[PDB]
C-alpha cells in the first residue's frame, strides 16, 4: 500500500531541512511515500514541457536518496494538462522527454496530474480521441510503457471527487471511460465525495472501485486543501472508519503548506493506517505527547506544557468540528443562554461562566508561551490563529461578564458548506450582532 | 519551609529500593524532607522505651545519607504517648536515652508524636501537671533542650484537626495551653478542619496560628489516611488555595502505604508549592506525562498510552470528587435518565449511552494493559480498584443496553461523610436497587 505525503501546494516550497523533518515524521508514522510536486517548481506544471537543468535534477536525486535512507519511495509530479494537445507528436515527445530525463536519472516513480483542463478538447485531438478520458489515458499508458516494467504511475483525474463526478461516481461518462482505458497497473487518486470530505464511507468507495475498475489511492484533503489557506487543522484524522481500508490501494495526506502544522496530521494518519482500534481522541493524545518536545522554550530546558499543546489541537481541530473540550464549554454556555437575562445566582450559569473564564486564561497563556519558543517557524504557524482565538474569547467573556452584572432587559452591551466548524465561527454563532449593530445571544 | 513525605503507615514498611524511588520523586518535586516513622518499626511507638540495636541504627544512618545525597533532610519519629508517665524520672530518662542515641549518631531531627493518649492523665502526673498539654510540652521542651541548638523538633498534637479541637480551634483548652507552653522553635502538625480535609482555607489557618501562637506545619491526609486502606487517590492536590501558603510553616504529604500509588500525589503537591498559577487539571496533565514511563510493558519498548494513564487518575481522583471526565459522562447519563423509559431514538440518550460504552471500552483496555506491565508493584497497586471499576461500568452498560431495547414500563432488568465520592459510589448512585431487589434509576 502507497502511504505518505504529497508536497503539492502553492506558496514557498519546503526548504531542505523542512523536507527532512517531514520525512522523519512520515517514517516514524510507519508510512512509506513522499511525492514531490510544488507549485513553486515551474517545471511541474506551468512550463511542463521544459526539462530540468543539471542542478535541479541533482536536487531531485538527493531528495530521492534522502527519502530512501528513511525507508520511503520518492515520486516526481508532471502536470501536462493545461495546454496539451494529446495527439500532437511534439507534445507527446515533450512529455516522453520529461519522463526519460527522470527515468534515466533513476527517478522512475511518477505522478501524472490532469486536475486542470480546458472546457473543450482541442480539435486537433477530437478526431482520434472521443473524450478527455480516452486522450489522458492514452498519454498516460505511453508514459507507463516507456518505463519498461521498472517504475510506477499514479494518475490524478480531472474529476477526483464525487461532486465533480456528478454525485454517484458510476454515473460519470469520464470516469467510466477512464476506468476501462487506463492501464490497470496505473493508480488513480480520489478525495472522496467532496474535495474536503467530512466522511469517507465503504459504500461510496465500493462505487468508486466499480467505475475505476480498481481500488483508488485516497488523496485526503481533510487536514489541508491547496485552495484554502486561511485554515489550520491540528486535530486527529476523523470520519474514516477502519472498514474502508480493504477498499483502497493507498493513502496520501495533503499537507498544510506550513511544514510545522503537519505533525498531528501525519502522526494520527499513521495510527489510523496501523491500528485496528484507532480512536481519534486517543490518537490525538498520543500525538500531543510525541509533539511536545518541539515546543522547547528559548534559552531553557522547559517546554510549553502538554495540557496547552492539547488545547492547541482542540481549538484548531477538524474541518467539520471544533475539538471536544472547547465544544463542551461553548455548548454549556449556549444551554445557560436560553434566557435573555441569565440569573447570576443560577448554578448552571455560574458553572458555564467559570469554564469560559478558565478557557480564556489558558488561551492567553498558550498564546504568550508560543511567542517564547525556540522553534520560530512553529510559532509563526499558529500565531495568527491564536491571535484571533484570543480576541474572540476576549469578546465573549466581556459579553458574559456584562450579563453577570445583571443589566436591565432593555440595556445593550457597550461596544469598543454548513457542516464546517471552528472556534471563531462557534463563538459568533453564540454571540450575534443584529441589524442595528447590537450584540445579543438569540434571546 | 519543611516540605515532603512522612512514612508513618501500617502494614509492611517500604523496602530500600522503594524508599529510594519515593525520595527521587520528592527531590524532583522540589521538596526537601523525608520523615521516617513506620508502624512496622516496633521502636517508634509500640515499645518506644527500647533503643535500637546496632544494625537498626545503621539502617537509619544510611537512610539519612541517602536523603542527604538527594537534597533532603531526614527525620526520625518517636511516639511516647500510649503509656507514658510524663513526670516519671525513669520514663523521662528512657525518652532522653532514645533522643541521645539518635543525636549521637547524627540523627538530630525528630518528630515527637502524641496522637494516641489515655482518656485520663496518670495520677502520678496530676500534681505537677494541670493537663495533657502542659505535660506533653514539658517533655518535648526537654528533648529540644537536650539537642543544644543542633537539631529540630516537630510535634504531632493529640488534637490535630478542627473536629478534634471542638470546631473553632481557638475554643480548645488543650491547644490554648499547648501554644503557650511548647517552645516556639518546635513546629506543630495540623491536618485542617478534618482528618482528611476537603478544603483548607485561610480563615481557618489564621485561627490555628492564633491558638498555636505559630504557623502550623500542614500534615495533609488528602491523598491517604493511615486508617482508610480501602482507597486510592491518583488525582491532583485540590481544595487548597495558594493564598494559604503565607500561613503555614511546612507541608508534609501523608503517602499511600503502596509506594507506587504516590507518584501524582507528590508530583502535583510539588507543583502546588512552587507555582503561583497552580491549577489541578493542568498539574495532573503534567504528572501523567512524567509518570507514563513507569508503565513500560513487559518484554517491549512500548508503555500504557498517556490517555489511559490519564483515565487511571480520573477514575481514582480525590476523596471528595470523581475526576472531571468520568463525572461529566455520568452526569450526562443522569440527565437522560430523568424518565423511567428513555426514548432510544432521543439524541441526548444516544449521546450519553455511546460515551458510556466508550468509557467501558477504555476501562477494559486499561485493565488488561496493566496486567501486562513490567513494574509488577504498579500493577498490584491498582488491580483491585480497576477490577471493581470494570465490574461496575459493566453492570451499568448492561442496564442501559437493556433500556435501549425499549422494555415495557413494568418490566424489570434481568439479574445475574457525604461529600465523599468515587466511581463505584457514583455508579450505584445512578443505578439503585429497591427493597424488592429491583434495579432502577430513581424514575
Ligand atoms: Cl507537561
Ligand atoms: Cl502515548
PDB file of N, CA, C and O in Angstrom, chain B residues 35-103:
ATOM      1  N   UNK B  35      10.321  12.023  56.420  1.00  0.00           N
ATOM      2  CA  UNK B  35      10.119  11.623  57.792  1.00  0.00           C
ATOM      3  C   UNK B  35       9.829  10.135  57.935  1.00  0.00           C
ATOM      4  O   UNK B  35       8.912   9.617  57.347  1.00  0.00           O
ATOM      5  N   UNK B  36      10.631   9.484  58.754  1.00  0.00           N
ATOM      6  CA  UNK B  36      10.561   8.058  58.988  1.00  0.00           C
ATOM      7  C   UNK B  36       9.877   7.745  60.296  1.00  0.00           C
ATOM      8  O   UNK B  36      10.269   8.225  61.317  1.00  0.00           O
ATOM      9  N   UNK B  37       8.791   6.998  60.209  1.00  0.00           N
ATOM     10  CA  UNK B  37       8.020   6.512  61.324  1.00  0.00           C
ATOM     11  C   UNK B  37       7.070   5.335  61.103  1.00  0.00           C
ATOM     12  O   UNK B  37       5.972   5.400  61.542  1.00  0.00           O
ATOM     13  N   UNK B  38       7.480   4.276  60.441  1.00  0.00           N
ATOM     14  CA  UNK B  38       6.550   3.197  60.132  1.00  0.00           C
ATOM     15  C   UNK B  38       6.106   2.396  61.324  1.00  0.00           C
ATOM     16  O   UNK B  38       6.855   2.156  62.231  1.00  0.00           O
ATOM     17  N   UNK B  39       4.847   1.998  61.268  1.00  0.00           N
ATOM     18  CA  UNK B  39       4.193   1.166  62.251  1.00  0.00           C
ATOM     19  C   UNK B  39       4.870  -0.178  62.320  1.00  0.00           C
ATOM     20  O   UNK B  39       4.824  -0.798  63.324  1.00  0.00           O
ATOM     21  N   UNK B  40       5.417  -0.635  61.212  1.00  0.00           N
ATOM     22  CA  UNK B  40       6.261  -1.833  61.177  1.00  0.00           C
ATOM     23  C   UNK B  40       7.427  -1.801  62.209  1.00  0.00           C
ATOM     24  O   UNK B  40       7.833  -2.841  62.742  1.00  0.00           O
ATOM     25  N   UNK B  41       7.970  -0.612  62.467  1.00  0.00           N
ATOM     26  CA  UNK B  41       9.147  -0.484  63.329  1.00  0.00           C
ATOM     27  C   UNK B  41       8.666  -0.443  64.780  1.00  0.00           C
ATOM     28  O   UNK B  41       8.093   0.558  65.206  1.00  0.00           O
ATOM     29  N   UNK B  42       8.901  -1.523  65.528  1.00  0.00           N
ATOM     30  CA  UNK B  42       8.395  -1.628  66.891  1.00  0.00           C
ATOM     31  C   UNK B  42       8.947  -0.553  67.846  1.00  0.00           C
ATOM     32  O   UNK B  42       8.346  -0.288  68.894  1.00  0.00           O
ATOM     33  N   UNK B  43      10.080   0.062  67.483  1.00  0.00           N
ATOM     34  CA  UNK B  43      10.763   1.027  68.352  1.00  0.00           C
ATOM     35  C   UNK B  43      10.083   2.407  68.326  1.00  0.00           C
ATOM     36  O   UNK B  43      10.164   3.164  69.281  1.00  0.00           O
ATOM     37  N   UNK B  44       9.405   2.733  67.229  1.00  0.00           N
ATOM     38  CA  UNK B  44       8.849   4.068  67.062  1.00  0.00           C
ATOM     39  C   UNK B  44       7.763   4.347  68.111  1.00  0.00           C
ATOM     40  O   UNK B  44       7.754   5.413  68.714  1.00  0.00           O
ATOM     41  N   UNK B  45       6.904   3.360  68.376  1.00  0.00           N
ATOM     42  CA  UNK B  45       5.683   3.597  69.138  1.00  0.00           C
ATOM     43  C   UNK B  45       5.322   2.488  70.131  1.00  0.00           C
ATOM     44  O   UNK B  45       5.243   2.754  71.331  1.00  0.00           O
ATOM     45  N   UNK B  46       5.090   1.260  69.645  1.00  0.00           N
ATOM     46  CA  UNK B  46       4.648   0.149  70.499  1.00  0.00           C
ATOM     47  C   UNK B  46       5.586  -0.170  71.677  1.00  0.00           C
ATOM     48  O   UNK B  46       5.122  -0.446  72.771  1.00  0.00           O
ATOM     49  N   UNK B  47       6.892  -0.138  71.436  1.00  0.00           N
ATOM     50  CA  UNK B  47       7.885  -0.325  72.511  1.00  0.00           C
ATOM     51  C   UNK B  47       8.883   0.826  72.445  1.00  0.00           C
ATOM     52  O   UNK B  47      10.077   0.612  72.278  1.00  0.00           O
ATOM     53  N   UNK B  48       8.361   2.051  72.519  1.00  0.00           N
ATOM     54  CA  UNK B  48       9.160   3.265  72.371  1.00  0.00           C
ATOM     55  C   UNK B  48      10.329   3.431  73.375  1.00  0.00           C
ATOM     56  O   UNK B  48      11.275   4.180  73.103  1.00  0.00           O
ATOM     57  N   UNK B  49      10.267   2.765  74.526  1.00  0.00           N
ATOM     58  CA  UNK B  49      11.334   2.876  75.535  1.00  0.00           C
ATOM     59  C   UNK B  49      12.608   2.118  75.155  1.00  0.00           C
ATOM     60  O   UNK B  49      13.671   2.300  75.779  1.00  0.00           O
ATOM     61  N   UNK B  50      12.494   1.236  74.166  1.00  0.00           N
ATOM     62  CA  UNK B  50      13.597   0.347  73.798  1.00  0.00           C
ATOM     63  C   UNK B  50      14.457   0.989  72.698  1.00  0.00           C
ATOM     64  O   UNK B  50      13.945   1.275  71.607  1.00  0.00           O
ATOM     65  N   UNK B  51      15.762   1.240  72.991  1.00  0.00           N
ATOM     66  CA  UNK B  51      16.664   1.789  71.965  1.00  0.00           C
ATOM     67  C   UNK B  51      16.907   0.785  70.828  1.00  0.00           C
ATOM     68  O   UNK B  51      16.740  -0.422  71.024  1.00  0.00           O
ATOM     69  N   UNK B  52      17.286   1.282  69.653  1.00  0.00           N
ATOM     70  CA  UNK B  52      17.669   0.413  68.536  1.00  0.00           C
ATOM     71  C   UNK B  52      18.910  -0.417  68.853  1.00  0.00           C
ATOM     72  O   UNK B  52      19.776   0.060  69.595  1.00  0.00           O
ATOM     73  N   UNK B  53      19.004  -1.629  68.289  1.00  0.00           N
ATOM     74  CA  UNK B  53      20.278  -2.381  68.287  1.00  0.00           C
ATOM     75  C   UNK B  53      21.216  -1.764  67.241  1.00  0.00           C
ATOM     76  O   UNK B  53      20.811  -0.855  66.504  1.00  0.00           O
ATOM     77  N   UNK B  54      22.444  -2.266  67.170  1.00  0.00           N
ATOM     78  CA  UNK B  54      23.467  -1.700  66.288  1.00  0.00           C
ATOM     79  C   UNK B  54      23.044  -1.631  64.821  1.00  0.00           C
ATOM     80  O   UNK B  54      23.196  -0.578  64.192  1.00  0.00           O
ATOM     81  N   UNK B  55      22.479  -2.723  64.293  1.00  0.00           N
ATOM     82  CA  UNK B  55      22.051  -2.794  62.877  1.00  0.00           C
ATOM     83  C   UNK B  55      20.917  -1.833  62.495  1.00  0.00           C
ATOM     84  O   UNK B  55      20.964  -1.188  61.437  1.00  0.00           O
ATOM     85  N   UNK B  56      19.895  -1.747  63.348  1.00  0.00           N
ATOM     86  CA  UNK B  56      18.789  -0.805  63.137  1.00  0.00           C
ATOM     87  C   UNK B  56      19.284   0.628  63.039  1.00  0.00           C
ATOM     88  O   UNK B  56      18.896   1.369  62.126  1.00  0.00           O
ATOM     89  N   UNK B  57      20.149   1.019  63.973  1.00  0.00           N
ATOM     90  CA  UNK B  57      20.721   2.369  63.961  1.00  0.00           C
ATOM     91  C   UNK B  57      21.434   2.630  62.638  1.00  0.00           C
ATOM     92  O   UNK B  57      21.218   3.665  62.012  1.00  0.00           O
ATOM     93  N   UNK B  58      22.245   1.667  62.203  1.00  0.00           N
ATOM     94  CA  UNK B  58      22.949   1.755  60.919  1.00  0.00           C
ATOM     95  C   UNK B  58      22.011   1.874  59.709  1.00  0.00           C
ATOM     96  O   UNK B  58      22.310   2.625  58.772  1.00  0.00           O
ATOM     97  N   UNK B  59      20.865   1.185  59.738  1.00  0.00           N
ATOM     98  CA  UNK B  59      19.858   1.353  58.690  1.00  0.00           C
ATOM     99  C   UNK B  59      19.346   2.796  58.630  1.00  0.00           C
ATOM    100  O   UNK B  59      19.138   3.335  57.548  1.00  0.00           O
ATOM    101  N   UNK B  60      19.143   3.414  59.793  1.00  0.00           N
ATOM    102  CA  UNK B  60      18.716   4.814  59.861  1.00  0.00           C
ATOM    103  C   UNK B  60      19.789   5.797  59.373  1.00  0.00           C
ATOM    104  O   UNK B  60      19.485   6.709  58.603  1.00  0.00           O
ATOM    105  N   UNK B  61      21.042   5.602  59.790  1.00  0.00           N
ATOM    106  CA  UNK B  61      22.122   6.461  59.287  1.00  0.00           C
ATOM    107  C   UNK B  61      22.264   6.386  57.763  1.00  0.00           C
ATOM    108  O   UNK B  61      22.478   7.396  57.130  1.00  0.00           O
ATOM    109  N   UNK B  62      22.093   5.204  57.181  1.00  0.00           N
ATOM    110  CA  UNK B  62      22.182   5.049  55.725  1.00  0.00           C
ATOM    111  C   UNK B  62      21.024   5.722  54.991  1.00  0.00           C
ATOM    112  O   UNK B  62      21.217   6.293  53.908  1.00  0.00           O
ATOM    113  N   UNK B  63      19.825   5.672  55.575  1.00  0.00           N
ATOM    114  CA  UNK B  63      18.689   6.405  55.031  1.00  0.00           C
ATOM    115  C   UNK B  63      18.943   7.910  55.018  1.00  0.00           C
ATOM    116  O   UNK B  63      18.716   8.564  53.999  1.00  0.00           O
ATOM    117  N   UNK B  64      19.406   8.448  56.145  1.00  0.00           N
ATOM    118  CA  UNK B  64      19.808   9.864  56.248  1.00  0.00           C
ATOM    119  C   UNK B  64      20.761  10.249  55.106  1.00  0.00           C
ATOM    120  O   UNK B  64      20.503  11.215  54.375  1.00  0.00           O
ATOM    121  N   UNK B  65      21.871   9.495  54.995  1.00  0.00           N
ATOM    122  CA  UNK B  65      22.880   9.705  53.940  1.00  0.00           C
ATOM    123  C   UNK B  65      22.256   9.611  52.547  1.00  0.00           C
ATOM    124  O   UNK B  65      22.606  10.376  51.660  1.00  0.00           O
ATOM    125  N   UNK B  66      21.313   8.683  52.359  1.00  0.00           N
ATOM    126  CA  UNK B  66      20.588   8.560  51.080  1.00  0.00           C
ATOM    127  C   UNK B  66      19.696   9.769  50.761  1.00  0.00           C
ATOM    128  O   UNK B  66      19.620  10.203  49.604  1.00  0.00           O
ATOM    129  N   UNK B  67      19.018  10.302  51.772  1.00  0.00           N
ATOM    130  CA  UNK B  67      18.201  11.506  51.589  1.00  0.00           C
ATOM    131  C   UNK B  67      19.088  12.717  51.362  1.00  0.00           C
ATOM    132  O   UNK B  67      18.785  13.539  50.511  1.00  0.00           O
ATOM    133  N   UNK B  68      20.170  12.825  52.134  1.00  0.00           N
ATOM    134  CA  UNK B  68      21.126  13.946  52.008  1.00  0.00           C
ATOM    135  C   UNK B  68      21.670  14.072  50.579  1.00  0.00           C
ATOM    136  O   UNK B  68      21.722  15.170  50.027  1.00  0.00           O
ATOM    137  N   UNK B  69      22.079  12.944  49.991  1.00  0.00           N
ATOM    138  CA  UNK B  69      22.611  12.912  48.627  1.00  0.00           C
ATOM    139  C   UNK B  69      21.626  13.447  47.579  1.00  0.00           C
ATOM    140  O   UNK B  69      22.027  13.887  46.482  1.00  0.00           O
ATOM    141  N   UNK B  70      20.343  13.408  47.934  1.00  0.00           N
ATOM    142  CA  UNK B  70      19.259  13.895  47.092  1.00  0.00           C
ATOM    143  C   UNK B  70      18.779  15.310  47.428  1.00  0.00           C
ATOM    144  O   UNK B  70      17.839  15.800  46.795  1.00  0.00           O
ATOM    145  N   UNK B  71      19.387  15.955  48.422  1.00  0.00           N
ATOM    146  CA  UNK B  71      18.935  17.289  48.862  1.00  0.00           C
ATOM    147  C   UNK B  71      17.740  17.269  49.810  1.00  0.00           C
ATOM    148  O   UNK B  71      16.876  18.156  49.774  1.00  0.00           O
ATOM    149  N   UNK B  72      17.694  16.259  50.675  1.00  0.00           N
ATOM    150  CA  UNK B  72      16.612  16.127  51.629  1.00  0.00           C
ATOM    151  C   UNK B  72      17.102  15.904  53.063  1.00  0.00           C
ATOM    152  O   UNK B  72      18.116  15.233  53.296  1.00  0.00           O
ATOM    153  N   UNK B  73      16.364  16.465  54.008  1.00  0.00           N
ATOM    154  CA  UNK B  73      16.643  16.324  55.426  1.00  0.00           C
ATOM    155  C   UNK B  73      15.817  15.143  55.919  1.00  0.00           C
ATOM    156  O   UNK B  73      14.636  14.990  55.524  1.00  0.00           O
ATOM    157  N   UNK B  74      16.437  14.311  56.757  1.00  0.00           N
ATOM    158  CA  UNK B  74      15.832  13.055  57.242  1.00  0.00           C
ATOM    159  C   UNK B  74      15.432  13.226  58.712  1.00  0.00           C
ATOM    160  O   UNK B  74      16.242  13.678  59.507  1.00  0.00           O
ATOM    161  N   UNK B  75      14.179  12.889  59.055  1.00  0.00           N
ATOM    162  CA  UNK B  75      13.680  12.956  60.441  1.00  0.00           C
ATOM    163  C   UNK B  75      13.379  11.561  60.967  1.00  0.00           C
ATOM    164  O   UNK B  75      12.998  10.696  60.194  1.00  0.00           O
ATOM    165  N   UNK B  76      13.510  11.345  62.276  1.00  0.00           N
ATOM    166  CA  UNK B  76      13.121  10.066  62.899  1.00  0.00           C
ATOM    167  C   UNK B  76      11.999  10.339  63.895  1.00  0.00           C
ATOM    168  O   UNK B  76      12.045  11.342  64.607  1.00  0.00           O
ATOM    169  N   UNK B  77      10.985   9.465  63.939  1.00  0.00           N
ATOM    170  CA  UNK B  77       9.823   9.636  64.824  1.00  0.00           C
ATOM    171  C   UNK B  77       9.958   8.863  66.116  1.00  0.00           C
ATOM    172  O   UNK B  77      10.543   7.770  66.155  1.00  0.00           O
ATOM    173  N   UNK B  78       9.363   9.432  67.161  1.00  0.00           N
ATOM    174  CA  UNK B  78       9.255   8.805  68.481  1.00  0.00           C
ATOM    175  C   UNK B  78       7.856   9.094  68.995  1.00  0.00           C
ATOM    176  O   UNK B  78       7.440  10.255  69.037  1.00  0.00           O
ATOM    177  N   UNK B  79       7.132   8.063  69.396  1.00  0.00           N
ATOM    178  CA  UNK B  79       5.758   8.255  69.837  1.00  0.00           C
ATOM    179  C   UNK B  79       5.539   7.717  71.251  1.00  0.00           C
ATOM    180  O   UNK B  79       5.029   6.607  71.423  1.00  0.00           O
ATOM    181  N   UNK B  80       5.923   8.514  72.264  1.00  0.00           N
ATOM    182  CA  UNK B  80       5.917   8.060  73.638  1.00  0.00           C
ATOM    183  C   UNK B  80       4.669   8.558  74.327  1.00  0.00           C
ATOM    184  O   UNK B  80       4.770   9.376  75.262  1.00  0.00           O
ATOM    185  N   UNK B  81       3.513   8.099  73.865  1.00  0.00           N
ATOM    186  CA  UNK B  81       2.240   8.700  74.267  1.00  0.00           C
ATOM    187  C   UNK B  81       1.234   7.708  74.866  1.00  0.00           C
ATOM    188  O   UNK B  81       0.466   8.068  75.761  1.00  0.00           O
ATOM    189  N   UNK B  82       1.257   6.468  74.383  1.00  0.00           N
ATOM    190  CA  UNK B  82       0.291   5.452  74.816  1.00  0.00           C
ATOM    191  C   UNK B  82       0.339   5.149  76.321  1.00  0.00           C
ATOM    192  O   UNK B  82      -0.715   5.012  76.958  1.00  0.00           O
ATOM    193  N   UNK B  83       1.538   5.043  76.892  1.00  0.00           N
ATOM    194  CA  UNK B  83       1.659   4.626  78.304  1.00  0.00           C
ATOM    195  C   UNK B  83       2.724   5.375  79.090  1.00  0.00           C
ATOM    196  O   UNK B  83       3.328   4.815  80.017  1.00  0.00           O
ATOM    197  N   UNK B  84       2.945   6.638  78.732  1.00  0.00           N
ATOM    198  CA  UNK B  84       3.959   7.458  79.417  1.00  0.00           C
ATOM    199  C   UNK B  84       3.434   8.082  80.710  1.00  0.00           C
ATOM    200  O   UNK B  84       2.283   8.528  80.791  1.00  0.00           O
ATOM    201  N   UNK B  85       4.295   8.073  81.722  1.00  0.00           N
ATOM    202  CA  UNK B  85       4.124   8.888  82.903  1.00  0.00           C
ATOM    203  C   UNK B  85       5.079  10.072  82.714  1.00  0.00           C
ATOM    204  O   UNK B  85       6.296   9.952  82.903  1.00  0.00           O
ATOM    205  N   UNK B  86       4.510  11.202  82.298  1.00  0.00           N
ATOM    206  CA  UNK B  86       5.256  12.413  81.929  1.00  0.00           C
ATOM    207  C   UNK B  86       6.232  12.955  82.976  1.00  0.00           C
ATOM    208  O   UNK B  86       7.238  13.568  82.610  1.00  0.00           O
ATOM    209  N   UNK B  87       5.924  12.728  84.258  1.00  0.00           N
ATOM    210  CA  UNK B  87       6.751  13.161  85.408  1.00  0.00           C
ATOM    211  C   UNK B  87       7.761  12.120  85.888  1.00  0.00           C
ATOM    212  O   UNK B  87       8.660  12.445  86.675  1.00  0.00           O
ATOM    213  N   UNK B  88       7.593  10.874  85.447  1.00  0.00           N
ATOM    214  CA  UNK B  88       8.398   9.771  85.950  1.00  0.00           C
ATOM    215  C   UNK B  88       9.855   9.878  85.523  1.00  0.00           C
ATOM    216  O   UNK B  88      10.143   9.916  84.327  1.00  0.00           O
ATOM    217  N   UNK B  89      10.781   9.915  86.503  1.00  0.00           N
ATOM    218  CA  UNK B  89      12.203  10.006  86.156  1.00  0.00           C
ATOM    219  C   UNK B  89      12.654   8.907  85.179  1.00  0.00           C
ATOM    220  O   UNK B  89      13.410   9.197  84.251  1.00  0.00           O
ATOM    221  N   UNK B  90      12.178   7.674  85.379  1.00  0.00           N
ATOM    222  CA  UNK B  90      12.535   6.537  84.514  1.00  0.00           C
ATOM    223  C   UNK B  90      12.023   6.687  83.073  1.00  0.00           C
ATOM    224  O   UNK B  90      12.719   6.328  82.123  1.00  0.00           O
ATOM    225  N   UNK B  91      10.815   7.217  82.917  1.00  0.00           N
ATOM    226  CA  UNK B  91      10.234   7.425  81.584  1.00  0.00           C
ATOM    227  C   UNK B  91      10.850   8.634  80.884  1.00  0.00           C
ATOM    228  O   UNK B  91      11.067   8.608  79.665  1.00  0.00           O
ATOM    229  N   UNK B  92      11.126   9.686  81.656  1.00  0.00           N
ATOM    230  CA  UNK B  92      11.824  10.869  81.148  1.00  0.00           C
ATOM    231  C   UNK B  92      13.214  10.478  80.653  1.00  0.00           C
ATOM    232  O   UNK B  92      13.636  10.889  79.561  1.00  0.00           O
ATOM    233  N   UNK B  93      13.902   9.676  81.475  1.00  0.00           N
ATOM    234  CA  UNK B  93      15.235   9.160  81.167  1.00  0.00           C
ATOM    235  C   UNK B  93      15.201   8.259  79.942  1.00  0.00           C
ATOM    236  O   UNK B  93      16.036   8.414  79.049  1.00  0.00           O
ATOM    237  N   UNK B  94      14.238   7.333  79.892  1.00  0.00           N
ATOM    238  CA  UNK B  94      14.064   6.459  78.721  1.00  0.00           C
ATOM    239  C   UNK B  94      13.884   7.259  77.407  1.00  0.00           C
ATOM    240  O   UNK B  94      14.493   6.918  76.385  1.00  0.00           O
ATOM    241  N   UNK B  95      13.085   8.328  77.449  1.00  0.00           N
ATOM    242  CA  UNK B  95      12.890   9.183  76.261  1.00  0.00           C
ATOM    243  C   UNK B  95      14.177   9.931  75.906  1.00  0.00           C
ATOM    244  O   UNK B  95      14.546  10.005  74.725  1.00  0.00           O
ATOM    245  N   UNK B  96      14.868  10.452  76.926  1.00  0.00           N
ATOM    246  CA  UNK B  96      16.128  11.147  76.688  1.00  0.00           C
ATOM    247  C   UNK B  96      17.203  10.195  76.147  1.00  0.00           C
ATOM    248  O   UNK B  96      18.002  10.593  75.306  1.00  0.00           O
ATOM    249  N   UNK B  97      17.197   8.937  76.590  1.00  0.00           N
ATOM    250  CA  UNK B  97      18.137   7.943  76.059  1.00  0.00           C
ATOM    251  C   UNK B  97      17.850   7.610  74.586  1.00  0.00           C
ATOM    252  O   UNK B  97      18.782   7.374  73.803  1.00  0.00           O
ATOM    253  N   UNK B  98      16.570   7.602  74.200  1.00  0.00           N
ATOM    254  CA  UNK B  98      16.226   7.409  72.808  1.00  0.00           C
ATOM    255  C   UNK B  98      16.799   8.565  72.015  1.00  0.00           C
ATOM    256  O   UNK B  98      17.522   8.361  71.042  1.00  0.00           O
ATOM    257  N   UNK B  99      16.467   9.782  72.446  1.00  0.00           N
ATOM    258  CA  UNK B  99      16.926  11.015  71.796  1.00  0.00           C
ATOM    259  C   UNK B  99      18.457  11.059  71.713  1.00  0.00           C
ATOM    260  O   UNK B  99      19.026  11.436  70.688  1.00  0.00           O
ATOM    261  N   UNK B 100      19.113  10.632  72.781  1.00  0.00           N
ATOM    262  CA  UNK B 100      20.576  10.706  72.840  1.00  0.00           C
ATOM    263  C   UNK B 100      21.224   9.728  71.865  1.00  0.00           C
ATOM    264  O   UNK B 100      22.189  10.078  71.179  1.00  0.00           O
ATOM    265  N   UNK B 101      20.674   8.512  71.796  1.00  0.00           N
ATOM    266  CA  UNK B 101      21.161   7.520  70.855  1.00  0.00           C
ATOM    267  C   UNK B 101      21.082   8.060  69.425  1.00  0.00           C
ATOM    268  O   UNK B 101      22.029   7.907  68.659  1.00  0.00           O
ATOM    269  N   UNK B 102      19.956   8.682  69.070  1.00  0.00           N
ATOM    270  CA  UNK B 102      19.769   9.215  67.727  1.00  0.00           C
ATOM    271  C   UNK B 102      20.703  10.424  67.506  1.00  0.00           C
ATOM    272  O   UNK B 102      21.368  10.525  66.472  1.00  0.00           O
ATOM    273  N   UNK B 103      20.756  11.324  68.488  1.00  0.00           N
ATOM    274  CA  UNK B 103      21.529  12.566  68.363  1.00  0.00           C
ATOM    275  C   UNK B 103      23.029  12.301  68.201  1.00  0.00           C
ATOM    276  O   UNK B 103      23.666  12.894  67.338  1.00  0.00           O
TER     277      UNK B 103
END
